[PDB]
Write a protein that binds this ligand. Structure first.
Ligand SMILES: CCCCCCCCCCCCCCCCCC(=O)OC[C@H](COP(=O)([O-])OCC(O)COP(=O)([O-])OC[C@@H](COC(=O)CCCCCCCCCCCCCCCCC)OC(=O)CCCCCCCCCCCCCCCCC)OC(=O)CCCCCCCCCCCCCCCCC
Ligand code: SF4
Lengths: 129, 115, 148, 209, 95
């Protein structure tokens, strides 16, 4: 459908050499994904819908001066975005990076019945609303 | 016609001493170069309509002054440029062949905004 | 009936009807709500010209404030708000727009409550806004007029 | 539109771009994937990668389109999408005072034949894209690192590139010359998690995909 | 201001203009630096009634880009009507 001397690339794409990241920062960097857990104090849900590329945390030494957290981890501040885990791993493998997986936290069915809260032979009666 | 202008209002482009018949002959050019395009193609049905019309009002009144506001193309000297540009296209897609359907649908959700 | 100002034949949770409209109405559940008032329990309370109507709802909203349980929000702080702005109405610390605001506020507490007490709070005061508007208009105009 | 908060909409030209969008769509249906307009009277027609030549050659030369003012050659990285790099053109019509905008999709490696022919303004922009995003373009006269530093590594606007970078610089006495050590920040960029977990706009919401 | 008469006519002559009528230094036309309290106006929608955010919520009024053609007799039309040629400024027609 795109016939212009196409090369049948059967090997997984590895663009790691073009981006030119330091060698110590492509192997000694565990790269992980997950969909953020909702902030338990906030009942809002419109954040646990995307996968992200976040890394492992290196050391944070206090500055000899007033005390800023001086860091030498350039890749630490690299929270990416991903619509689906399949696209998330696709980025991970395309620039081959030591990675692990994680399953989307899926809600369970809350069987809710306000009529249950008051009962005669059932113990789910609530003493105070 | 009238007195031939000295400046077109744009540097580089000069007043043509041969305004209408030059535009006409190159217009007959863009009738015939369009010939080797099949009729079902959309660009033909757009072009020959826009072609065969403005070949009309140029021969409708040979004078330069009225024809500026016949086509809303400004001064005639830039209409020569733009009609030539339309000629360039007819030569361009003579090899582009832009009428068989869309090459391939975009890769999954390749637009998908927002993400 | 001439010295009368407004009988309320429904009671507390029922819109006060001005004396003129009381002269021409049937008291059934249908006909009264055609006049936009309620009949409820047929608690026919009579109140004449000498007493000021803003003072009448002053004690009425005070009763509602002391009877709300605070369970649902629109009644809890809502019935508190009606008493507060109406307290300005009685003395006259308001403006003609504020009459519209309390009607708008009365619209918000209408229906949104768990029970009909919040709705029952609207009906008397809501009837006032539609019926005794000039009486409210003179009430808070006088306070500012002779304050200066 | 008696209210003065929201900006008024303009429908007469709103229908005009859509009519012109279909007008372009019918002529060259081989390369136009989908065309649409937004609320703010901005039409965008979407082209296939190998379509940089004729679509712009169309808008540059058509007697009824004649969009010649090349506005900007932008790129938008989208890591989710397979063709993350999205080269974006932008043309302005002098006679018809409108702004066309065509955008394509491209991988890290896949090229685009240089559109310097239709607009030589793209030539100088074209250098920036390979500097700024890194997408190489085919048969480009001189496609150079022109805006980043000499001998830089990688592409800073790939969303995988740290904001601080990879190499810091200082003058060193023992070499009497500027040496590029790896970065070591005095203070770390205190990222802020700024995303309200409640629905922002029910209009543009993505349905369950 | 400042200067004396015979100097003014010297610079008036050398410049061919009357500089004393208007100069490039402020002497007394400057507004007083301390000013009365600036009572600012209010917003156009500043009203206790019928101003719900259900009415003016421009961020919400926006609709995702209206799609017309997707991958998955007629007449020619223009992106906009052709522009019109501006006339010479009747104030200064020729510099
Ligand atoms: C050469 C021309 C002749 C000598 C200078 C004449 C001159 O300055 O005349 C005053 C004055 C200076 O110029 P101006 O712009 O009119 O002055 C505006 C203000 O009055 C100026 O306001 P002001 O506040 O400056 O006025 C006070 C000012 C007044 O200053 C003067 O009158 C200058 C002479 C001071 C002795 O004196 C001072 O400021 C004190 C400090 C003086 C600094 C050093 C002056 C050296 C003068 C030459 C010394 C010998 C060489 O010029 C005239 O009145 C007419 C032009 C000169 C005519 C000269 C005779 C022909
Ligand atoms: S409206 Fe009813 S439920 Fe709600 S606070 Fe008032 S009395 Fe309680």
């Amino acid at each position: 459908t795109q016939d212009t001397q196409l090369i049948a690339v059967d090997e997984k794409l590895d663009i790691t050499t073009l981006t030119g990241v330091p060698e110590e920062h492509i192997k000694t960097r565990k790269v992980r994904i997950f969909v953020p857990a909702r902030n338990n104090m906030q009942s809002g849900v419109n954040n646990t819908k995307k996968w992200k590329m976040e890394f492992d945390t290196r050391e944070r030494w206090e500055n000899p001066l007033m005390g800023w957290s001086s860091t030498a981890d350039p890749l630490s501040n690299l929270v990416l975005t991903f619509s689906t885990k399949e696209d998330a791993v696709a980025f991970a493998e395309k620039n081959g990076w030591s990675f692990d997986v994680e399953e989307r936290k899926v809600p369970k069915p809350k069987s809710k019945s306000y009529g249950a809260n008051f009962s005669w032979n059932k113990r789910t009666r609530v003493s105070t609303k | 016609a009238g007195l031939l202008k000295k400046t077109t209002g744009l540097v580089g482009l000069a007043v043509c001493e041969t305004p209408h018949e030059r535009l006409k002959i190159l217009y007959t050019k863009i009738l015939d170069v369009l010939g080797q395009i099949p009729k079902n193609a959309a660009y033909r049905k757009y072009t020959e309509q826009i072609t065969n019309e403005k070949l009309g009002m140029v021969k409708a009144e040979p004078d330069v002054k009225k024809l500026e506001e016949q086509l809303q193309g400004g001064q005639i000297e830039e209409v020569i440029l733009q009609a030539e540009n339309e000629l360039s296209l007819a030569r361009k897609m003579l090899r582009w062949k832009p009428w068989e359907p869309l090459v391939e649908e975009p890769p999954a959700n390749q637009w998908k905004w927002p993400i | 009936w001439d010295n009368l100002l407004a009988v309320i034949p429904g009671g507390s949770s029922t819109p006060l009807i001005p004396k003129s409209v009381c002269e021409t109405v049937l008291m059934d559940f249908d006909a009264l709500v055609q006049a936009q008032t309620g009949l409820g329990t047929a608690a026919v309370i009579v109140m004449d010209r000498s007493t000021d109507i803003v003072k009448a709802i002053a004690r009425l909203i005070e009763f509602y404030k002391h009877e709300s349980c605070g369970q649902c929000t629109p009644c809890r702080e809502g019935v508190d708000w009606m008493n507060k702005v109406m307290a300005r109405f009685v003395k006259g610390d308001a403006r003609p727009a504020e009459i519209d605001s309390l009607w708008e506020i009365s619209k918000q507490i209408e229906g949104h409550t768990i029970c009909a007490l919040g709705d029952g709070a609207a009906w008397p005061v809501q009837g006032l806004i539609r019926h005794f508007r000039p009486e409210l208009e003179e009430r808070m105009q006088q306070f500012a007029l002779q304050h200066q | 539109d008696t209210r003065p908060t929201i900006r008024p909409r303009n429908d007469v030209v709103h229908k005009q771009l859509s009519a012109f969008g279909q007008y372009v769509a019918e002529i060259l249906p081989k390369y136009v994937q989908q065309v649409q307009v937004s609320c703010f009277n901005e039409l965008e027609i979407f082209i296939h990668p190998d379509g940089v030549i004729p679509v712009l050659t169309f808008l540059r030369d058509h007697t009824n389109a004649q969009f010649k003012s090349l506005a900007d050659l932008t790129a938008v990285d989208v890591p989710t999408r397979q063709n993350r790099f999205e080269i974006v053109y932008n043309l302005l019509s002098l006679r018809f005072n409108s702004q066309i905008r065509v955008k394509t999709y491209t991988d890290e490696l896949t090229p685009i034949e240089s559109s310097v022919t239709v607009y030589k303004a793209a030539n100088w922009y074209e250098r920036e894209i390979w500097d700024m995003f890194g997408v190489f373009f085919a048969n480009h006269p001189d496609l150079r690192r022109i805006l980043t530093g000499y001998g830089f590594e990688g592409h800073p606007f790939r969303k995988d590139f740290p904001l601080s970078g990879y190499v810091e610089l200082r003058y060193d006495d023992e070499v009497k010359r500027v040496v590029a050590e790896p970065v070591e920040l005095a203070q770390e960029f205190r990222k802020f998690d700024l995303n309200s977990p409640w629905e922002a706009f029910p209009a543009y919401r993505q349905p369950p995909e | 201001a400042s200067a004396t008469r015979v100097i003014q006519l010297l610079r008036n002559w050398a410049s061919g203009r009357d500089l004393q009528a208007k100069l490039q230094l402020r002497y007394q036309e400057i507004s007083k630096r301390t000013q009365p309290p600036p009572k600012l106006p209010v917003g156009p929608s500043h009203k206790l009634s019928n101003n719900y955010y259900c009415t003016r919520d421009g961020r919400r009024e926006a609709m995702p880009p209206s799609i017309v053609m997707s991958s998955q007799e007629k007449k020619a039309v223009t992106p906009a009507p052709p522009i019109k040629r501006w006339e010479l400024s009747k104030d200064q027609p020729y510099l």
